[PDB]
């Protein structure tokens, strides 16, 4: 088993603990900790009902929920100082994006036939640009394929690598003459702030993924 | 490419898709209905 | 507060320096009690 | 609670799963191609 | 070998074109939020118009991206 | 009615009592849960009108 | 041609420049001005007809340049010289009123009036 | 290098225990209370109905 | 050889910069559309033809840049 | 060679310039959100999702520029 | 060698340009905060956390750019 | 030496990063002045927020400057 | 040696570009003052301390840039 595999097991066990014994006694009012994952439940309920509302909304709610929760946990766990970055293996995140994009294309073809490509005929316009708006709509349609993945990957990777570069630099900042030990707090404070910011952009990315691939799924489920 | 050109791409991707299927099933069959149980139990008390 | 109520209160205040006419002061002092009328019926004659 | 409740995720999420299998195979061939680079 | 050096340089320069489209995308979406707050109820009609404008603005950036790839990959 | 009044008085759950026990006293719970899962709707109407929704929208 | 009027009496209902305090800041109207509607806020108003200038203290209202270049100013009551210390004492009392509390709005308006007065 | 990250994480946990953990206590408490109060209210309500 | 072909690649890269202007441009027309339409409501049916014209013209400047890029490629 | 490795490093630097347009873009969307919310008050429930959508796409064009930088530099 | 070492320094510099866009970005968010609070007098309880969110996203592009600057300078 | 030339040239290029902060700060102060001129009395809340915004805008510029010094001195 | 002196004078030119941002900035602060005064002249004295503060702060970023310029040119 690889380093990546070992940390995927660790992520799975973290997620298991968040419901298995986060709810003590299966209390009616429920333990205070489960109130957090209740609020998460409600804001993704109202988001994917907000997006892909309709008869099939709750039929895609487990999928949109594990797309929140995977990215939400994996951009907190990966932010631990000595923990192996699964997400810094871009190939899992980019593959998941392509899979969902292809799984939108297949769903679209299945659900809406060969008139699936009428999704890429947007609306009435004067006739010399009716075909044009199909070409540079389809160009944008498989720009949707990679965009969703490349957002999350770039942000998370750049955060960890930035932090490590500054951390190594402040190490060598504190290995020069003793006057640097005095008032060497300003670069340390920058690293503290960067670590604080990285939790934020990880939760922001975890929500933004699951809404954006609700927007693509909105297009696929309901043509226009 | 600090680990972005291994040959272990398929190793990574295999364990990756295994984790997704596990979490999908796990949420859907176990834990999501345990939240929906809280909602419904609360609503049953509300109705009662 | 109502926009015209806002202007009204301001006008009443604005007659305060002072040199002012009785008619101004009379114009700035109300003399009524609005009788709210329910459906026949009538909630209390609150001083307008 | 932690009772296994049936969810119809085996036919709703069929186009997603078809895409997963295709990428799985394609990455096998891609991994073999990248290991010669 | 000048050609190979240039291939990498040329790719970099191509990247510059994209910035304008990024600004453009924001300009359409700014109008969307502004408009919706201005009318209230315009939103259902306006949202398709907006998506069209987004796609078109985006497409200019896509052209720039393609030229980057054309140099880079060859 | 005397007996029921006494039963609510001598055992009033309003904090705890297992929700599993609420399922045990009412399989109506599981009937609704199963029907909701079968329906593919995870909105519970009535829940929202007397318990708020945490939302960021 | 200015039409400046109060229900109490008309004032000008020819006039070259009128300077008005509006929710759109301050508006000055000079000859042809594009036809507008403006909420007049509690105000100090200056009217100049030729170079002769008459100064009005105005309790807010509405202002409307009409499309026939007729500046309808309507307000509840007014001259600046007529308005022009005891009121400052009253306004102090009005600060006291804010402590307890329509009375809240009233006391707030009294503060607005204190500003309007301070302008004098 | 990485010991700098552990110091920052410790600092982060200090800020959390100062700010977030009581804030989240108050948030959690508020919700917990609201739910509990609804429950006990319905129980009270239902005792009334028996008497009615 | 090496230098001239190299120079072609350089020139092509530079040409993308011209496109950026069109990118901002298309958006400005569309922004106006959303603002205008939210302001009037009803103008939209008359305005939508005008909007298409504006889109096309904005795009056209970009097309000139694009074809120069293609020539160099 | 020296020339080729240099050309990669220089080319990467040029690519990084692209991010600026998206950076300003993202702020414009959030500004519109704050502006809208202050104008309406109550619209926010609808408008916040709309803003999140606008954010994502504006961000993505910059990130495309970033990815070219990464590709040249790392590769 | 000398050319490669030079290319590190130059590459960092070029990357530093991009930061300017994020600087403007932050300012736009705060401008909107000021403007909004000035419009409503009272939007602020909602709008202040909303503004901090806007700040964080606009800032982030600059920081990615800054990372590339450091990668080029330091290696 | 080419390395010596490179640090001087590079120092120049890095200085350009400051430009954005210079525009930025002025927009914050402009908005402060516009806001306060509209409200009058908003200033008590708003002036602290304006200084916060100023600091953050300037902070980005300091990163630019720190890179500039890393080139120039280093 | 000639390379060093060349780089110095070229480099001096490059830094000077940064000043443009401040040049727009100063105008923006003064424009705001003029507009504020015209929209309400009574606020003017409250605004006046903030106005001088804003002018200085806008100019200052340009002076940071200018110190780098002089470090290259004279130093």
Author numbering:
A (entry chain T): 26 to 249
B (entry chain Z): 1 to 48
C (entry chain I): 8 to 23, 27 to 49, 53 to 61
D (entry chain Y): 1 to 37
E (entry chain 6), L (entry chain 3): 2 to 75
F (entry chain V): 117 to 173
G (entry chain H): 11 to 23, 26 to 90, 92 to 97, 99 to 115, 118 to 136
H (entry chain U): 54 to 105
Sentences from the paper on this structure:
To test the hypothesis that the peripheral stalk of ATP synthase deforms under strain, we next added ATP to the preparation and froze cryoEM specimens. Classification of the resulting dataset yielded maps showing six different F1 states, corresponding to the catalytic and binding dwell structures from each of the three main rotational states. Subclassification of these populations separated each catalytic and each binding state into conformations with increasing rotation of the rotor relative to subunit a, and increasingly strained peripheral stalks, designated as ‘a’, ‘b’, ‘c’, etc. Overall, 27 unique conformations were identified: State 1binding(a to d), State 1catalytic(a to h), State 2binding(a to b), State 2catalytic(a to e), State 3binding(a to c), and State 3catalytic(a to e). To facilitate comparison of the ATP synthase conformations that occur during ATP hydrolysis, backbone models of the protein structure were fit flexibly into each of the 27 maps. Remarkably, the α3β3γδεc10 models from all 18 catalytic dwell conformations could be overlaid with high-fidelity (left), as could the nine α3β3γδεc10 models from binding dwell conformations (right), with some limited flexibility at the interface between F1 and the c-ring. This observation shows that, other than being in a catalytic or binding dwell conformation, the differences between the structures are mostly due to deformation of the peripheral stalk subunits and the rotation of the c-ring relative to subunit a in FO. Without ATP and during ATP hydrolysis, the left-handed curvature of the peripheral stalk remains the most highly populated conformation of the enzyme.
